[PDB]
């Protein structure tokens, strides 16, 4: 029989569980805010022919913007909600000529993610990304 | 027409020796001349094949078909005759072994088309047959494993012979 | 000294001979009347067989839903095992996990899970070392974990189990759950329980105190397969009721002398009340925390 | 048709003819009628040829049943439990003699398609071919391009 | 050979892993001998329904 | 010093003709595998050595591709067959030697 | 309604044979089957076996004790098999052991005994009796005849032949109707063993041969799921056996069996039996 997270929960226990998981997620973001103080990987200078990582942003909207010759350009606002580099794959491991980096975006519900997903993010110490 | 399902219910067996398995009870029931299509009734019967009696009753109670209601009535009266006449101990200890729908006696009516054209409508009827067997429902057949697939491949390879020679 | 195998089949033989003795004490069939007085299907009369029939047999008369959801039975207001034979013409009432007051069902569940963990420990530690089972403390549900007290070897007086060892305990418990054994019950004489558990002084003391608290010196024994234990009360029908099971932690008790008593703590949840992954992890952490009685 | 009929391999009953030959015909039952024009040939056969056949085959029991019937028949029972019912309706005495002799020389095995018109139990004497027949060995059994 | 029936059958119908080299060889000749070995036409026990092919490793 | 075929894989074959020239006599004793040509034969402290019984259930695609990689076949051998072919199959085949 | 009778009669016969194929009758003995005459069947049994049986001895060889017990029971509502059965069984053991150890002098007593028990076993003797129609002439209680009853009846027939014709003639009979069963089979198909390597090292020790060494003569695959191993058993750097297998251990076991075969004289290319 199918079950969801709050099926066998009482009226007293539903807001407690919600508050508890919200506080845990905010605590995990607060823990992950200091990578350089924690332990950086070797930071290398930019060499020509290199390729850096991108990000995942939420498309927020559109806005006018005028340039100094008095010309209008319409811009798109993309909001970086929470980007997190989550996994690194070496050139030998991946079937490709270049290494890969996985980046995760918008924070979603552990109750609505799958189990292997939840174990992966539990090992990473981050809430799941959309 | 033929009523061998009812005669199957009226079949009798010799008395049992005290040292052999208990021969679980079999109950045959049918409803004839149901104003419903045998194909749709087949869909309902193929739904309730191999289920427990209570599982079948739940599924038919929350299905949305006239055939589902009719089959639910037939299943209830088959359970009643089971533990009223055939010495079934518990009314929940039954499962559906056979469940199928057959064609009934239909009627030919005219369907008026355009021009002077016409068609023949068929007032379709159907039968429903059910067989209830005492005992827990049999376990579903487990899916074939990779070990079993490798085993059958090796058995073919070891069953190979040198053909068209001595 | 008897090997673990041979103490196992002698206990099984004694249990089987006592059960056969009770069944021979009730040789002829006798009809008792059971008045189902539950809120649902009210005023239903069964005419059960005396000392053969079960509340599971009554539930099987009623419907499959009552079999799958009924965890305990109230026989004249007392908690009754689902596979325990009925003796007297009484009134019955089936208790599930999702009632208004499931406290007795909870107590039976937590006692069953403790006895399963004790079986796992006893058949998990090695032949060259020595295992003895003290008791399962009647710990409340609110604490978060089931406790079994085990006296281990002086060679392992310094030894602490690791995470893979705890996961091996959990895998053995899940193997028991998959094997799906019924919880067989026997109301037995204190003498008979004494020769069953004669090679365990702690079991002798426990049997003696249960015989002291009741007037007729009748104690309760329960069996899943080959493991036999003395219980504080009624149990759930089958190990397959348990869905989420984990042997969380192992601790030492404070008095190391005269002997080292190790409290094994685990946490479990039935199929009808299965929790999510995150909620289950939080329950795991609380079960890993210390539980004191 | 081979695909539409059963099949079998060449065989004997009990390794027949190895030590000694055992006639596989065991019983012949002749249903013949006294008054049947269809049974006239079998009447002549019972009159003249069945005595000599019974003398030539002492291992076969021959029953003759003279009863009112329209189709005279012969039922040949063979030692491996085989039964062959054949109509001798409107056959002359020499046709019946040919048929009864043919039944005597049959075995009880089915007259179906016989695959492989020979059957040996020891097909090879020098050893059946495996790939490593006619392949030379190598110093220390080395595989190709083994670095040792 | 005096083998038992199952080991004898296994020995007869087992597969062989042949090795073949390129290195200035014509691919058509390579392909002809590789095709014979892949079909199993080099075996006297060959039949098209007997699945008597062998592995060929061309480098 | 002449041999029609190399004499080191199956048998030492010697051909001969009888004095009348009417029949050909072949002598072929088997060759034996040399010893030097052979190869020598190939060769938790506190709990049980618990038997490592995991059987992961692969869905049909991964299971068939694993079987195909194992046995060097295609997927079509491993995909199932219908009831028509399953009941057409002869379950008591004839058996010679 | 079409006129006529022939088509309707033919369809009646068609319906009868279809009903028989749908609901088969229980098996009934050839005695209760219609055409039957016991004395004629006994005489034809002797004549088709080409043996000069004694008639009373053959009838007493076919009469069993269970048939005796059933027929007094029917009387309330003579000589049994036992002496003839024991004579035939004892002569079968002695004579078969004599043929086997004269044709194969190198088998030890355990192997000769196991071959004799295979030839006088239940399956072989019941197969021979069924295809010689001892069952049709057997007077017993139940049909089909139980295999112990059929084996006892067959050996009673052997004892009757021994009493009537003589040891050489019934030796020829045993030679035919049992060595023909031994014909197409393998030594370890008839005599089951457990540890061929242990038997081989015991034989080599008792005939003063150094212990065999297993070596990998030939190998194909090895990492795949269908490997091929030829393991050779060597003694004093000299090959005595070779065997194939899918794994190394089963190849070594097969090589041990081949060594036992060669040492015992049961090789596939051995000299066939002289008839």
Phi-psi region of C41 (alpha: psi -120 to 50; beta: other; left: phi over 0): left
**Burial of residue D75, with CB atoms counted within 10 A of its CB: 0-12 exposed, 13-18 middle, 19 or more buried:** middle
CA dist., res. C274 & res. A5, Å (int): 9
- Phi, psi at residue C26, to the nearest 5°? -110, 70
Whats the size of chain G, residue-wise? 275
Q: Which domains does chain B have, with CATH numbers?
A: 1-166 (3.90.470.10)
Q: Alpha carbon of F55 to those of B152, C188, F31, G75, G189: distances in Å?
A: 18, 42, 48, 66, 36
Which token pair is A108? 């979603």
Chain C residue with minimal CA distance to B56? C64
- Cβ–Cβ under 8 Å, residues G219 and G230: yes
Instruction: Please identify among residues 188-227 of chain G the ones whose CB lies closer than 8 Å to any CB of chain B.
Output: 225-226
Q: Are C122 and C229 in contact (CB under 8 A)?
A: no
Please choose, from the candidates F80, E53, F73, the residue with its C-alpha nearest in 3D space to the C-alpha of residue G225: F73
The two three-digit tokens of residue G178, written as one number: 């049992």
Both tokens of residue C234?
């009624």
Separation in Å, CA of E5 to nearest CA in chain G:
9
Judge whether F83 is closer than 8 Å to chain C, CB to CB: no
Interface residues of C toward A, Cβ cutoff 8 Å, are 98, 273-279, 281-282
Cβ atoms within 10 A of the Cβ of D112, count? Answer: 11
Q: Which chain G residues are within 8 Å of F38, Cβ to Cβ?
A: 215-217, 232, 234
F4 touches F11 (CB < 8 A): no
Q: Is there a contact between F95 and D116 if contact means CB atoms under 8 Å apart?
A: no
The DSSP symbol for E35 reads H
List C residues 213-272 in contact with B (Cβ-Cβ < 8 A): none
In degrees, rounded to 5, the angle at the alpha carbon of residue C75 between the alpha carbons of residues C70 and C80 is: 60
Radius of gyration for the alpha carbons in chain B, expressed in angstroms and rounded: 23
Single residue among G194, G222, G250 that ends a domain in this structure: G194
Residue with tokens 């062959």: D84
Q: How far G265 CA sits from the closest chain F CA (Å)?
A: 18
Residue G251 lies in a domain: yes
Angle at which helices G167-174 and G82-103 cross, to 10°: 70
Peptide bond into D66 cis (omega under 30): no
- Residue A67: count of CB within 10 angstroms of its CB: 8
Q: What is the DSSP letter of D140?
A: G
C160 CB-near residues (< 8 Å, 6+ apart):
C250
Identify the helix (H) or strand (E) that includes residue A20: helix A13-32
Spatial distance between the Cα atoms of C133 and C119, rounded to a whole number of angstroms: 9
**Rounded-to-integer distance, Cα D32 and Cα D88, Å:** 9
**Which member of D19, D61, D79 has the closest CB to residue G275?**
D19
- 8 A C-beta contact, residue D36 and residue D72: yes
Is F touching C (3+ C-beta pairs, cut-off 8 A)?
A: yes
Q: Is B92 left (phi over 0), alpha (psi -120 to 50) or beta?
A: alpha
Query: What residues contact residue D68 under an 8 Å CB cut-off, 6+ apart?
Result: D33, D34, D35
G230 Rama class: left (phi>0) / alpha (psi -120 to 50) / beta:
beta
d(CA C278, CA A17): 10
Select from A20, A111, A122 the Cβ nearest to the Cβ of C276: A111
Find residues 105-144 of chain C whose CB sits inside 8 Å of chain F: 124-126, 129
Residues 153-192, chain G, touching F (beta carbon < 8 A): 184
Q: Which of B76, B85, B90 is nearest to B136 (CA)?
A: B90
**Angle CA G63–G69–G75, to nearest 5:** 110
Spell out which residues of chain B touch residue D120, defining contact as CB-CB under 8 Å: 166
C147: phi then psi, degrees, rounded to nearest 5 = -125, 140
Q: Record the tokens describing residue G125, joined without a space.
A: 């003797």
Subunits with 3+ Cβ pairs within 8 Å of D are: B, E, F, G
Alpha-carbon span C148 to C169, nearest angstrom = 13
Question: The tokens 């107590």 sit on which residue?
Answer: C107
Asked if G168 and G35 sit in the same domain, the reply is yes
Check CB contact of E12 with chain B, cutoff 8 Å: yes
- Omega of the bond leading into D123 within 30 degrees of 0 (cis): no
Cα gap G48→G132, rounded to integer Å = 10
Query: Rounded to 5 degrees, what angle do the CA atoms G143, G144, G147 make?
Result: 125
Q: Which of G178, G181, G179 is nearest to G155 (CA)?
A: G178
Task: Find chains touching chain A: ≥3 CB pairs under 8 Å.
Answer: C
How crowded is residue B56: how many other Cβ atoms within 10 Å of its Cβ? 25
Rounded distance, CA D130 to CA D4, Å? 35
G and F touch per CB criterion (3+ pairs under 8 A): yes
Residue G4 lies in a domain: no
CA distances from B78 to B10, B71, B75, B84, B112 (A): 14, 10, 5, 10, 42
3-state secondary structure of A102: strand
Which of C254, C279, C255 has its CA nearest to residue C267?
Answer: C279
Sign of CA dihedral A92, A95, A97, A103: negative
If asked whether residues G229 and G151 sit together in one domain, one would say no
**Best residue in B90, B95, B137, B139 for a mutation probing chain C (most C CBs within 10 Å):** B90
- List D residues 70-129 in contact with E (Cβ-Cβ < 8 A): 124, 127-129
End-to-end CA separation in angstroms for chain C: 34
- With vertex at residue C54, the alpha carbon angle to CA C48 and CA C55, rounded to the nearest 5 degrees, is 95
Cα F91 to Cα D4, F88, F94, distances in angstroms: 16, 9, 10
Cα distances (angstroms) measured from residue E50 to each of D116, D134, E41: 17, 21, 11
3-class secondary structure, E18:
strand
Q: Say if residue G151 is in the same domain as residue G257.
A: no
Residue G254, in any domain of the structure: yes
Contacts of D123 in chain B (CB under 8 A): 166
Chains G and E touch (3+ CB pairs under 8 A): yes
The label of the residue with tokens 């359970």 reads B79
Residues G133 and G156 in one domain: yes
Distance (Å) from the alpha carbon of G137 to chain F's nearest alpha carbon: 31
Nearest Cα neighbor of F70 from E11, G226, E9, E16 is G226
Is G136 domain-assigned?
Answer: yes
CB pairs under 8 A between B and F: 16
- Closest listed residue to residue G140, CA positions, set G69, G89, G73, G200: G69
Residue F69 near chain G (CB below 8 Å): no
Cβ–Cβ contact G169 with D under 8 A: no
For A44, the 3-state DSSP assignment is: coil
List the single residue in F with minimal CA-CA distance to C122.
Answer: F47
Q: C103-122 vs C163-179: helix axis angle to the nearest 10?
A: 110
F28–G contact, CB cutoff 8 A: no
Method used for this model?
Answer: cryo-EM
Q: Of all helices (H) and strands (E), which one includes residue D66?
A: strand D61-66
Question: Which subunits sit against E, judged by 3+ Cβ pairs under 8 A?
Answer: B, D, G
From chain B, pick out residues whose CB is under 8 angstroms from the CB of E6.
158
Closest C-alpha among C184, C127, C121, C120 to residue C155: C127
**Of D64, G27, G102, E7, the residue nearest B158 (C-alpha):** E7
Task: Name chain F contacts of G234, Cβ cutoff 8 Å.
Answer: 35, 38
Count CB neighbours of E22 within 10 A.
Answer: 10
Q: Is B157 within 8 Å of G226 when comparing Cβ atoms?
A: yes
G58 is a domain residue: yes
CA distance G26 to G110: 43
G1 inside domain: no
Measuring CA to CA, how many Å separate B154 from each of A51, B148, E13, E14, G226?
51, 10, 12, 12, 9
Partners of D130 on chain E (C-beta within 8 Å) are: 11-12, 14
> In this complex, do G225 and B150 lie within 8 Å of one another by their Cβ atoms?
yes
DSSP for F13-38, written as a single string: -EEEE-TTSS-EEEE-PBP---TTTS
Contact F67 B149 (CB under 8 A): yes
Where a domain ends, among G141, G174, G194?
G194
Residue C169 CB neighbour total at 10 angstroms = 23
* Residues G85, G177 share a domain: yes
Helix, coil or strand: residue B60: helix
Give the C-alpha separation, B154 to G262, whole Å: 30
Whether residues G108 and G85 share a domain: the answer is yes
- The verdict on G182 and G255 lying in the same domain is no
Residue pairs between chains C and F whose CB atoms are closer than 8 Å: 17
Pick from G145, G171, G194: which residue ends a domain?
G194
E25 has a chain B CB within 8 A of its CB: no
Contacts of C72 (CB under 8 A, 6+ apart): C79, C80, C81, C82, C94, C95, C104, C105, C108, C234, C236
What's the CA gap between C158 and A67, in Å, rounded?
77
CA distance C30 to C16: 23
- Find the residue in D nearest to B163 (Cα): D116
- Rounded alpha-carbon distances, angstroms, from residue D102 to D13, D24, D95: 17, 12, 10
Residue pair C79/C92 in contact (Cβ under 8 Å)? The answer is no
Q: Give the residue from D34, D122, D114 showing the smallest Cα distance to D72.
A: D34
Write down the residue that tokens 């007290």 correspond to: C149
Is C165 at the interface with chain F, CB within 8 A? yes
Total residues found in chain C within this entry:
293
Give the containing element (helix H, strand E) for A67: strand A58-67
Q: What is the 3-state secondary structure (H, E, C) of chain G?
A: CCCCCHHHHHHHHHHHHHHHHHCCCCCCCCCCCCCCCHHHHHHHHHHHCCCCCCHHHHHHHHECHHHHHHHHHHHHCCCCCHHHHHHHHHHHHHHHHHHHHHHCCCCCHHHHHHHHHHHCCHHHHHHHHHHCCCCCCCECCCCCCCHHHHHHHHHHHHHHHHHHCCHHHHHHHHHHHHHHHHCCCCHHHHCCCCCHHHHHHHHHHHCCCCCCEEEEEEEECCCCCCCEEEEEEEECCEEEEEEEECCHHHHHHHHHHHHHHHHHCCCCCCCCCCC
3-state DSSP: chain F helix, strand, coil percent, rounded to 5? Answer: 20, 15, 70
For chain G, what is the domain count? Answer: 2
Cα G159 versus chain centre, distance = 18
Q: In the beta sheet, which residues pair with residue C151?
A: C132, C261
Q: CA C238, CA C225: separation in Å to the nearest integer?
A: 11
- Dump strand ranges (E) for chain B: 26-34, 94-103, 107-112, 118-123, 126-134
Rounded to whole angstroms, how far apart are CA atoms C276 and C268?
13
The whole-angstrom separation of Cα C51 and Cα A48 is 88
Query: Any residues with CB less than 8 A from the CB of G103 and at least 6 apart, and which?
Result: G273
Cβ–Cβ gap F46/C129 under 8 Å:
yes
8 Å CB contact of C277 and A21: no
The first and second tokens of residue G254, run together, are 């097969």
Q: Which residues on chain G are in Cβ contact (under 8 Å) with E17? A: 220-221
CB G54 within 8 A of CB G163: yes
Query: Looking at residue A107, what DSSP letter applies?
Result: B
Cβ atoms within 10 Å of E6's Cβ, excluding its own: 14
Q: How many residues does chain B have?
A: 166
E6 touches chain G (CB under 8 A): no
Can you tell me the distance from the alpha carbon of E4 to that of G254, in angstroms, rounded to the nearest whole number?
7
In 3D space, the residue among G87, G92, G98, G154 whose CA is nearest the CA of residue G126 turns out to be G154
* CA nearest to D76 within chain G: G35
Shared-domain flag, residues G115 and G242: no
Interchain touch G–D (≥3 Cβ pairs closer than 8 Å): yes
Structure tokens at G168: 């050489």
Structural domains for chain D: 1-148 (3.40.30.10)
Q: C88: which 2 tokens? A: 């007297």
Query: Is the CA virtual torsion B33, B37, B42, B44 positive or negative?
Result: negative
- Read out DSSP for chain C? ---HHHHHHHHHHHHHHHHHHHHHHS-S--EEEEEE--SSS-SEEEEEETTT--HHHHHHHH-HHHHHH--EEEETTEEE-TTSPP-S--EEEEE-TTSS--HHHHHHHHHHHHHHHHHHHHTTB-SSS--EEEE-----GGG--EEEEEE--GGGSS----HHHHHHHHHHHHHHHHHT-B-EEEEEEHHHHHHHTTT-HHHHHHHHHHHHHSTT-EEEEEEETTEEEEESS---SBGGGEEEEEEEEEEE-S--SS--EEEEEEEEEEGGGPPPHHHHHHHHHHHHS----
For residue G25, being part of any structural domain is answered with: no
In which residue are the tokens 């003694």 written?
Answer: G235
Residue E26 to chain D, least CA–CA distance (Å): 22
What phi, psi does B128 have (nearest 5°)? -125, 130
Residue of D20, D83, D128 to mutate, interface with G, max G Cβ within 10 Å: D20
Q: Domain check: are G115 and G166 in the same one?
A: yes
First to last CA, chain A: 27
Picking from G262, G231, B153, the residue whose alpha carbon sits closest to that of residue E7 is G231
Phi, psi (degrees; rounded to nearest 5) at D108: -80, -5
What are D100's two structure tokens? 């009864």
Alpha-carbon gap, residue B79 to B132, rounded angstroms = 8
Q: How many residues does chain F have?
A: 97
On whether both G148 and G246 belong to a single domain, the answer is no
Which letter, b or e, does each residue of G251-261 get, where b requires 16 or more Cβ atoms within 10 Å of its Cβ? Answer: bbbbbbbbbbb
SS3 A28: helix
Of G157, G160, G120, G123, the closest CA to residue G137 belongs to: G157
CA dihedral (C80, C81, C82, C83) positive or negative: negative
Partners of E10 on chain G (C-beta within 8 Å) are: 228, 244-246
How far apart are alpha carbons C28 and C33 in whole angstroms? Answer: 17
Same domain? G98 vs G184 = yes
What is the distance between the alpha carbons of residues G268 and G274, in angstroms, rounded to a whole number? Answer: 16
**Domain shared by G46 and G107, yes or no:** yes
Core vs surface per residue A12-37: b (16+ CB within 10 A) or e: eeeeebeeebeeebeebeeeeeeeee
For residue G206, give its domain range: 195-269
Hey, are the CB atoms on C61 and B52 less than 8 Å from each other?
no
Least Cα distance to G130 among G115, G145, G148, G152 occurs for: G145
Binary contact (G219, F39; C-beta < 8 A): yes
The three-class DSSP label of residue D78 is: strand
Longest dimension (CA), chain E: 46
Q: ∠ CA B91-B92-B96 to the nearest 5 degrees?
A: 105
Contact predicate G239/G233, CB 8 Å: yes
Q: Which helix (H) or strand (E) holds F5?
A: none
User: With an 8 Å Cβ cutoff, is C159 touching chain F?
Assistant: yes
Bridge partners (DSSP) listed for residue B110: B120
8 Å CB contact between B134 and B110: no
Which residues of chain G are within 8 Å of residue B157 when distances are taken between CB atoms?
A: 226
- Return the number of other C-beta atoms located less than 10 Å from residue G7's C-beta: 10
| CA D42 – CA D92 distance, rounded (Å) | 7
């Amino acid at each position: 029989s199918g079950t969801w997270w709050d099926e066998h929960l009482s009226e007293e226990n539903v807001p407690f569980i919600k508050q508890l998981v919200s506080d845990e997620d905010k605590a995990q973001l607060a823990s992950k805010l200091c990578p350089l103080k924690d332990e950086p990987w070797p930071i290398h200078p930019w060499e020509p022919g290199s390729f850096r990582v991108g990000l995942i942003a939420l498309k927020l909207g559109m806005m006018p913007l005028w340039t100094k010759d008095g010309q209008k350009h319409v811009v798109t606002l993309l909001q970086v909600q929470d980007c997190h580099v989550l996994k690194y794959t070496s050139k030998e491991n991946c079937n490709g000529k270049m290494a890969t980096l996985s980046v995760g975006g918008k924070t979603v519900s552990r109750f609505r993610k799958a189990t292997s997903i939840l174990e992966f993010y539990r090992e990473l110490g981050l809430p799941p990304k959309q | 027409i033929s009523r061998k399902w009812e005669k199957k219910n009226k079949i009798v067996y010799p008395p049992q020796l005290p040292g052999e398995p208990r021969r679980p009870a079999e109950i045959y029931h049918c409803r004839r001349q149901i104003k419903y299509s045998k194909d749709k009734m087949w869909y309902l019967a193929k739904l309730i094949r191999g289920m427990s009696i209570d599982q079948a009753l739940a599924q038919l109670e929350f299905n949305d078909k006239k055939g589902a209601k009719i089959i639910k009535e037939v299943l209830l009266e088959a359970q009643d005759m089971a533990v009223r006449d055939h010495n079934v101990e518990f009314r929940s200890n039954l499962y559906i072994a056979e469940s199928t729908s057959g064609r009934g006696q239909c009627l030919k009516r005219i369907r008026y088309h355009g021009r002077g054209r016409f068609g023949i409508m068929e007032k379709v009827y159907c039968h429903y047959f059910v067989k209830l067997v005492e005992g827990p429902p049999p376990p579903p057949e487990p899916p074939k494993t990779a070990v079993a697939h490798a085993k059958e491949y090796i058995q073919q390879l070891r069953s190979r012979t040198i053909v068209h020679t001595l | 000294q008897l090997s673990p195998t041979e103490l196992t089949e002698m206990r099984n033989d004694l249990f089987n001979k006592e059960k056969a003795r009770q069944l021979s004490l009730t040789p002829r069939t006798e009809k008792i009347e059971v008045k189902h007085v539950g809120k649902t299907d009210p005023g239903t009369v069964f005419v059960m067989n005396k000392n053969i029939s079960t509340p599971y047999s009554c539930a099987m008369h009623l419907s499959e839903w009552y079999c799958r959801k009924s965890i305990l039975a109230l026989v004249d207001g007392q908690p009754w095992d689902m596979y325990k034979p009925l003796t007297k013409s009484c009134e019955i009432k089936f208790l599930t996990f999702k009632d208004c007051d499931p406290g007795e069902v909870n107590k039976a569940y937590w006692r069953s899970c403790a006895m399963m963990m004790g079986c796992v420990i006893e058949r998990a530690f090695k032949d060259e070392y020595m295992v003895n089972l003290v008791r399962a403390p009647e710990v409340p549900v609110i604490s978060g974990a089931f406790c079994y007290d085990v006296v281990l070897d002086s060679k392992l007086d310094e030894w602490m189990p690791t995470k893979e060892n705890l996961r091996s305990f959990t895998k053995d418990a899940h193997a028991l759950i998959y094997k799906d054994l019924p919880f067989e019950t026997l109301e037995v004489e204190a003498k008979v329980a004494l020769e069953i558990f004669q090679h365990s002084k702690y079991k002798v003391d426990f049997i003696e105190e249960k015989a002291s608290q009741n007037p007729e010196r009748i104690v309760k024994l329960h069996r899943i397969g080959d493991f036999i234990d003395v219980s504080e009360g009624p149990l759930i029908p089958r190990t397959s009721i348990c869905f989420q099971y984990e042997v969380s932690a192992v601790h030492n008790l404070q008095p190391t002398q005269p002997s080292l008593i190790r409290r094994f703590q685990g946490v479990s949840l039935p199929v009808h009340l299965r929790a999510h992954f995150t909620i289950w992890d939080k329950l795991l952490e609380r079960s890993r925390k210390m539980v004191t009685e | 048709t081979a695909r539409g009929t059963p099949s079998r391999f060449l065989a004997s009953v009990l390794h027949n003819g190895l030590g000694r030959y055992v006639q596989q015909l065991q019983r012949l039952s002749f249903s013949v009628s006294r008054d049947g024009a269809s049974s006239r040939g079998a009447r002549e056969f019972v009159e003249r040829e069945v005595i000599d056949f019974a003398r030539r085959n002492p291992g076969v029991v021959i029953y003759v049943n003279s009863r009112p019937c329209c189709v005279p028949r012969v039922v040949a029972e063979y030692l491996n439990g085989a039964v062959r019912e054949e109509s001798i309706h409107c056959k002359s005495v020499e046709e019946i003699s040919t048929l009864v002799q043919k039944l005597a020389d049959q075995s009880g095995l089915d007259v179906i398609r016989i695959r492989k018109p020979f059957h040996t139990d020891n097909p090879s004497i020098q050893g059946q071919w495996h790939p490593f027949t006619n392949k030379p060995t190598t110093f220390r059994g080395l595989r190709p391009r083994e670095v040792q | 050979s005096s083998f038992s029936r199952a080991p004898q059958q296994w020995a007869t119908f087992a597969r062989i892993w042949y090795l073949l080299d390129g290195k200035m060889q014509p691919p058509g000749k390579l392909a002809a001998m590789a095709s014979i070995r892949l079909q199993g036409l080099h075996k006297p026990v060959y039949h098209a329904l007997s699945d008597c092919g062998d592995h060929v490793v061309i480098m | 010093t002449y041999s029609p075929l190399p004499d080191d894989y199956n048998c030492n074959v010697e051909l001969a003709l009888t004095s009348d020239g009417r029949t050909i006599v072949c002598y072929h004793p088997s060759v034996d595998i040399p010893y030097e040509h052979t190869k020598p034969i190939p060769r938790d402290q506190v709990l049980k050595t618990r038997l490592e019984e995991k059987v992961e259930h692969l869905e049909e695609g991964p299971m068939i591709e694993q079987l195909s990689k194992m046995f060097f076949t295609t997927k079509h051998r491993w995909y199932p067959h219908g009831r028509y072919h399953r009941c057409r199959k002869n379950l008591n085949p004839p058996k010679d030697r | 309604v079409k006129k006529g009778f022939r088509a309707a009669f033919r369809f009646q016969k068609e319906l009868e044979r279809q009903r028989l194929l749908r609901c088969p009758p229980p098996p009934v003995r050839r005695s209760e089957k219609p055409n039957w005459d016991y004395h004629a069947e006994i005489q034809a049994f002797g004549h088709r076996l080409q043996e000069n049986f004694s008639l009373d001895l053959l009838k007493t060889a076919f009469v069993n004790s269970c048939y005796i017990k059933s027929e007094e029971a029917k009387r309330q509502q003579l000589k049994s098999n036992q002496e003839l059965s024991e004579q035939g069984t004892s002569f079968s053991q002695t004579c078969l052991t004599q043929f086997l150890e004269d044709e194969y002098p190198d088998m030890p007593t355990e192997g000769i005994k196991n071959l004799v028990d295979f030839l006088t076993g239940e399956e072989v003797v019941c197969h021979v009796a069924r295809n010689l129609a001892v069952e049709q002439l057997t007077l017993s209680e139940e049909f089909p005849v139980p295999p112990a009853v059929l084996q006892q009846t067959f050996f009673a027939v052997i004892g009757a032949l021994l009493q009537s014709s003589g040891p050489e003639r019934t030796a020829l009979f045993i030679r035919d109707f049992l060595i023909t069963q031994m014909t197409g089979k393998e030594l370890f198909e008839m005599w089951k063993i457990i540890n061929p390597m242990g038997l081989l090292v015991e034989e080599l020790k008792k005939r003063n041969v150094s212990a065999p060494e297993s070596r990998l003569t030939r190998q194909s695959g090895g990492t795949t799921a269908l490997p091929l191993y030829f393991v050779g058993l060597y003694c004093d750097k000299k090959l005595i056996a070779e065997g194939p297998g899918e794994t190394v251990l089963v190849a070594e076991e097969e090589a041990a069996r081949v060594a036992l075969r060669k040492l015992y004289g049961f090789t596939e290319n051995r000299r066939p039996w002289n008839y």
